Design a protein around this ligand. Structure first.
Ligand SMILES: COc1cc2cc(OC)c1OCCCOC/C=C/COC(=O)[C@@H]1CCCCN1C(=O)[C@H]2C1CCCCC1
Length: 128
């Protein structure tokens, strides 16, 4: 399902065009403005390893996930991906290890050389 559809006609949003981060918009946002680097960004997400063994949701807590875009608080794929989103957008991203946790991984939660999948809802973003 959702990951497979992202592989299939998945929009490659890397600069190098190496298919490291593929995207589909599933619910369209409003406003023309995507976040610039530095913006304080508020999201809900669901995430999983493609190996199917771990799943993580912002809802597993009772709060949005907040982070500063482009300030290395998240994996490179998030900085690239959420910079393409509009307020109120829901998107799916499929991510190769290079744009996530690489060969080292982040044990034991993230194995070596893992591919990741996320659904992200962009709630809001303000300047700082
Ligand atoms: C690698 O560590 C984790 C990764 C994710 C969630 C974690 O805790 C809930 C988590 O545990 C340690 C606490 C880390 O919290 C700060 C940030 C971690 C970096 O996370 C990320 O960049 C991405 C994007 C933003 C949401 C979290 N996230 C993760 O990679 C998640 C994992 C969790 C395992 C399934 C795939 C998603």
């Amino acid at each position: 399902g959702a990951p497979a559809t992202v592989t299939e006609q998945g929009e490659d949003i890397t600069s190098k065009k190496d298919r490291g981060v593929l995207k589909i918009v599933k619910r369209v946002g409003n406003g023309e403005e995507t976040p610039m680097i530095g913006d304080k960004v508020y999201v809900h997400y669901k995430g999983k390893l493609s190996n199917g063994k771990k799943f993580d949701s912002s809802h597993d807590r009772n709060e949005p996930f907040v982070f500063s875009l482009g300030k290395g608080q998240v994996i490179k794929a998030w900085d690239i991906g959420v910079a393409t989103m509009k307020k109120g957008e829901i998107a799916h991203l499929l991510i190769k290890p290079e744009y996530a946790y690489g060969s080292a991984g982040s044990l034991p939660k993230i194995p070596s050389n893992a591919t990741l999948f996320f659904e992200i809802e962009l709630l809001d973003f303000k300047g700082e």
